[PDB]
C-alpha cells in the first residue's frame, strides 16, 4: 500500500513532469515518468552521480523544456536522454537516465556480449519503459504537475498506483526454440556448425534473471531473439540469416556483411563482448570441424 521509505528522504516514488514556463494547456507531452528512487539509490552508492551539482534537488530546477541559466541552458531532454556526454576535466561528469543504463550493458559481462551485437530500435515500447504513467492520472493534475502545483501527496500516491502496478514480461522459454541448429547453408572447407541454440539462450538468461533493469526494458516476450534474429518482427520461426545475408558481395545492400561474415562476425562478436575463454576467434575448428 504506501512505499518503502527510502533512507535519503527523497520520495520511494516520484512522477516527473515536462516543467516548462511555457504554458501548456493541452498537455502536449510525452506520459510522465514514474522514476523509482528506492531502487536506485539502494544500487548507485553515491548521490552525487546523479546529483552531479551535489544539490538534492530536483533536475528540473535547472533543466526545463526550453533550458535556462541555472542548467545552462541545457534542456530536459537532454538532461534525460543524452547519450554522448564529454567527460568533465574537473568536477562530476553528469549522467542521464539513458546514459547510465547504456553504461550498464557495455560495463557488465552478462549484458556486454548481446550488447556488442545488439542494435536497439528504441521504439515505442523502449520510451514507455519510462514514459509510463497510471492511467489514473488526470488532465488537470498534469497540468498541476508542469505547473508544480500538484501536492506532494497528490504526486506519491500516482507514483505508488503506478509502481503497484507494473508488471514485467516474461521471456519465452528457450524450450521453444531449436535445441540445436545445424548451420550448413556454407559448408564446403568445414563440416556444418553444430549451434547449441538452447543451451546460448538458457545460459545467457540465466545469468540476468533476476535483473531489474534488464527486466524492465526486455519488454515484449520473445525480444531476447532479436539478439540474433535481428531486423525481422519478433516471432519463433523468425527468416533464416541467409534471407537477407547473400553467400556473396551484395553491392546493393553494402551494410550487409555476406554470409559468412555475418556468422563470424555476430558469433564472434558476442564472444569478445563477454570474454568467452573458448572458443578464441582464431580457433577454426571448435566452431566447425575440417572437412575430410
Ligand atoms: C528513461 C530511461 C527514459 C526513456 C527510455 C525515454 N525517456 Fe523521455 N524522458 C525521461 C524523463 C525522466 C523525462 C523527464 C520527465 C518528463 O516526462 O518530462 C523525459 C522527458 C522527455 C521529453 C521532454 C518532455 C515532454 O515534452 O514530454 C520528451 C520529448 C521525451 N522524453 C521523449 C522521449 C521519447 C520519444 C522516448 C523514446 C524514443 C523517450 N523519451 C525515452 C526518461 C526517458
Ligand atoms: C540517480 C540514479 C540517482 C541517485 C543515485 C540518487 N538520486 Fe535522488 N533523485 C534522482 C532523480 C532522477 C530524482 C527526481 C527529480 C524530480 O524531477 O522529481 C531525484 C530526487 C531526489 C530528491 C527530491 C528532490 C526534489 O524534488 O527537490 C531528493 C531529496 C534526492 N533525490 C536525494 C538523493 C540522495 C540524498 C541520494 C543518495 C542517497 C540520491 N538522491 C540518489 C536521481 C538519483
Ligand atoms: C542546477 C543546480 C542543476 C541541477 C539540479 C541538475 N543539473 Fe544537470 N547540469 C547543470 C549544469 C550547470 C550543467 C553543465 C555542467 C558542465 O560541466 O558543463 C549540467 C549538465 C548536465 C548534463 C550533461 C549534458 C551534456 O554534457 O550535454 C546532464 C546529462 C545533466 N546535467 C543531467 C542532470 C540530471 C539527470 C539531473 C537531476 C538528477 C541534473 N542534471 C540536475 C545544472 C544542474
Ligand atoms: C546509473 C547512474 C543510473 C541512472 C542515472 C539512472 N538509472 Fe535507471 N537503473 C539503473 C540501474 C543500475 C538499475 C537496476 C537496479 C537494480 O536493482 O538492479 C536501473 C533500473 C531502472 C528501471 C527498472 C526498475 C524500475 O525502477 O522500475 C527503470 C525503468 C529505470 N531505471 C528508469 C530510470 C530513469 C527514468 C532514470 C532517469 C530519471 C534513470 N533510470 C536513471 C541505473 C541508473
Ligand atoms: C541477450 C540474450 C541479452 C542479454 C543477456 C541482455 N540484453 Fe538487454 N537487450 C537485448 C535485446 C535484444 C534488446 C532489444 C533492443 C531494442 O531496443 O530493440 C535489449 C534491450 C535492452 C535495453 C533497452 C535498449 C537500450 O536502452 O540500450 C536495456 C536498457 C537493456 N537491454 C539492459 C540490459 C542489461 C542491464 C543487461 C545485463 C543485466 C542486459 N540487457 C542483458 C538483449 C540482451
Ligand atoms: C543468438 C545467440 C541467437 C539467439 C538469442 C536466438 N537464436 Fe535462433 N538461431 C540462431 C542462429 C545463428 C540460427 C541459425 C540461422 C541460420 O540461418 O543459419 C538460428 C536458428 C533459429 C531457427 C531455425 C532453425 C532451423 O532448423 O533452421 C529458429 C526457428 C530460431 N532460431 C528461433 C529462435 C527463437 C524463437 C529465439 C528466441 C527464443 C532464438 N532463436 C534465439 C541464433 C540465435
Ligand atoms: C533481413 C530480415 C535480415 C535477417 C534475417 C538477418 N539480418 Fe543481419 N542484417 C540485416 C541488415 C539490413 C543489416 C545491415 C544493417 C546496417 O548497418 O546497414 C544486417 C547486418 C548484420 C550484421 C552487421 C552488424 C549489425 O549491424 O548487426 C551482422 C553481424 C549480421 N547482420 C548477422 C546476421 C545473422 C548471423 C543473422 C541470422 C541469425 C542475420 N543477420 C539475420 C538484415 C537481416
Ligand atoms: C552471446 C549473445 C553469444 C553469441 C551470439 C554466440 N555465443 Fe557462443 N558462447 C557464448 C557464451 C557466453 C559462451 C560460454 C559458455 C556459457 O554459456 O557460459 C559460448 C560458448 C560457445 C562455444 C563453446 C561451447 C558451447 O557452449 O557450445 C561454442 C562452440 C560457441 N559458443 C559457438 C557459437 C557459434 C557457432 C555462434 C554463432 C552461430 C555463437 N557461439 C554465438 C555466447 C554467445
Ligand atoms: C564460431 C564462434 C566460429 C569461429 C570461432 C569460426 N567460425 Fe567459421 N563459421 C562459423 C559459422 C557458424 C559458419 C557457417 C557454417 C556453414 O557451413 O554454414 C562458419 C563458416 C565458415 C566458412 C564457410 C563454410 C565452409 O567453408 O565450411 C569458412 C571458410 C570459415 N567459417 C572459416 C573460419 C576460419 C578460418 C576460422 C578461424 C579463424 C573460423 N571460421 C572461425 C562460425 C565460426
Not at 542548467?71 to 561528469?93: F, Q, S
Not at 502545483?149 to 526454440?177: C, I, R
Not at 550487409?256 to 555476430?266: C, D, E, G, S, T
Request: glycine share 6%; aromatic share 4%; charged share 25%.
Amino acid at each position: 500500500a504506501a512505499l518503502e521509505p527510502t533512507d535519503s528522504g527523497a520520495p520511494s516514488a516520484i512522477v516527473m513532469f515536462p516543467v516548462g514556463e511555457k504554458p501548456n494547456p493541452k498537455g502536449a507531452a510525452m506520459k510522465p515518468v514514474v522514476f523509482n528512487h528506492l531502487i536506485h539509490e539502494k544500487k548507485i552508492d553515491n548521490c552525487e552521480t546523479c546529483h552531479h551539482t551535489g544539490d538534492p534537488v530536483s533536475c528540473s530546477t535547472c533543466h526545463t523544456v526550453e533550458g535556462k541559466a541555472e542548467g545552462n541552458y541545457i534542456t530536459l531532454d537532454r538532461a534525460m536522454h543524452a547519450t554522448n556526454i564529454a567527460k568533465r576535466a574537473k568536477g562530476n561528469t553528469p549522467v542521464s537516465c539513458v546514459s547510465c543504463h547504456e553504461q550498464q550493458t557495455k560495463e557488465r559481462r552478462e549484458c556486454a556480449g548481446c550488447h556488442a551485437i545488439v542494435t536497439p530500435k528504441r521504439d515505442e515500447a523502449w520510451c514507455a519503459t519510462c514514459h509510463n504513467i497510471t492511467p489514473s492520472m488526470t488532465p488537470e493534475q498534469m497540468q498541476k504537475g508542469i505547473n508544480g502545483t500538484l501536492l506532494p501527496g497528490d504526486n506519491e500516491a500516482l507514483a505508488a498506483e503506478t509502481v503497484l502496478a507494473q508488471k514485467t514480461v516474461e521471456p519465452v522459454s528457450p524450450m521453444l526454440a531449436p535445441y540445436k541448429v545445424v548451420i550448413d547453408a556454407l559448408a564446403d572447407k568445414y563440416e556444418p556448425s553444430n549451434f547449441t541454440h538452447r543451451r546460448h539462450l538458457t545460459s545467457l538468461m540465466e545469468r540476468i534473471k533476476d535483473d531489474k533493469l534488464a527486466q524492465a526494458f526486455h519488454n515484449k516476450p520473445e525480444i531476447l531473439c532479436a539478439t540474433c534474429h535481428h531486423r525481422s518482427p519478433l516471432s519463433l520461426t523468425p527468416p533464416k540469416c541467409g534471407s537477407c545475408h547473400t553467400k556473396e558481395i551484395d553491392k546493393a545492400n553494402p551494410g550487409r556483411p555476406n554470409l559468412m561474415a555475418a556468422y563470424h562476425l555476430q558469433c564472434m562478436g558476442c564472444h569478445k563482448g563477454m570474454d568467452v575463454a573458448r572458443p578464441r576467434d582464431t580457433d577454426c575448428t571448435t566452431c566447425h570441424k575440417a572437412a575430410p
